[PDB]
Amino acid sequence: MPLILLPAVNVVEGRAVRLVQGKAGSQTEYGSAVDAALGWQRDGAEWIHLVDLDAAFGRGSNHELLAEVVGKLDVQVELSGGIRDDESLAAALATGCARVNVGTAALENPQWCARVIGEHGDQVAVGLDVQIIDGEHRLRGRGWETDGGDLWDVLERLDSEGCSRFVVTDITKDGTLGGPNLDLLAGVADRTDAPVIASGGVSSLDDLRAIATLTHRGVEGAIVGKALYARRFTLPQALAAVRD
Numbered sequence: 001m002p003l004i005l006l007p008a009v010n011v012v013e014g015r016a017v018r019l020v021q022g023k024a025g026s027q028t029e030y031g032s033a034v035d036a037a038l039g040w041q042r043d044g045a046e047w048i049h050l051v052d053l054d055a056a057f058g059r060g061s062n063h064e065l066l067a068e069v070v071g072k073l074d075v076q077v078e079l080s081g082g083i084r085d086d087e088s089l090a091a092a093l094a095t096g097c098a099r100v101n102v103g104t105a106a107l108e109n110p111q112w113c114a115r116v117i118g119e120h121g122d123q124v125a126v127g128l129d130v131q132i133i134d135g136e137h138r139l140r141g142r143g144w145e146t147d148g149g150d151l152w153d154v155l156e157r158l159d160s161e162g163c164s165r166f167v168v169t170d171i172t173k174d175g176t177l178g179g180p181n182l183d184l185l186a187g188v189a190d191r192t193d194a195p196v197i198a199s200g201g202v203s204s205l206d207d208l209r210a211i212a213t214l215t216h217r218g219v220e221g222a223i224v225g226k227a228l229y230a231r232r233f234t235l236p237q238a239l240a241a242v243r244d
């Protein structure tokens with residue numbers, strides 16, 4: 001199957017935004033989150049990667065608006081941000097979303113995370129957001145403010161636990177239009193049979209073709225934010241590119 005494309009809708013105060021390397025001072029904005037989501041659906045999206053960035057940064061919630069978005073969409077939503085306990089996991093799932101991503105809690109609450117992987121299966125994926133410095137692949141939590149440990153040790157543990165899916169970001173590529181980190185993606189994909197979703201850095205249709213070349217190694221899809229919002233290319237171009 002071709003690479004699945006997931007347009008990102010990253011929500012700050014109800015708006016679709018992007019950041020450069022997850023840093024608040026670099027925020028660009030693209031309208032209402034609901035209009036963004038509906039637009040990508042109109043354009044052909046199979047999936048929306050819907051992120052509550054206020055919740056990821058521990059500074060607020062867009063949960064009600066995200067529930068509205070999920071409810072209005074016909075297509076599948078992968079929902080994340082703030083999903084750190086039983087209450088917030090249930091609230092997320094109660095929206096009717098297809099699945100969630102857990103970030104911080106995989107780092108800080110491994111037992112909880114293992115429990116929810118166990119109970120929820122394919123509805124729970126883990127986001128592995130990686131900052132690589134001098135070869136050290138570190139996970140980042142809490143809106144990428146915190147250190148969450150070594151990627152490979154955590155990946156190994158999650159994989160052992162049965163984690164359904166991993167959503168992998170090179171944080172230093174996220175929002176940069178600098179290209180995906182294909183090394184990191186292949187590295188993760190080669191260490192798990194669980195599907196991997198590539199997130200961050202896409203800058204061109206050729207970047208998507210490049211990620212597509214990894215589908216056989218288990219890279220199932222790619223999340224695309226800035227290239228779409230900035231109108232580097234269109235969704236149908238992208239959908240067509242991954243089938244070249």
Ligand SMILES: NC(=O)c1ncn([C@@H]2O[C@H](COP(=O)(O)O)[C@@H](O)[C@H]2O)c1N/C=N\CC(=O)[C@H](O)[C@H](O)COP(=O)(O)O
Binds near residue numbers: 023056141142
């Ligand atoms: N500081 C951040 O920006 C950030 N911090 C956490 N998350 C996510 O918050 C959730 C974890 O929350 P929690 O720990 O569980 O509360 C997880 O999903 C974290 O992965 C972020 N999402 C970043 N990009 C969002 C995205 O969708 C890009 O648009 C996409 O990579 C495309 O990038 P592009 O434009 O194409 O380069």
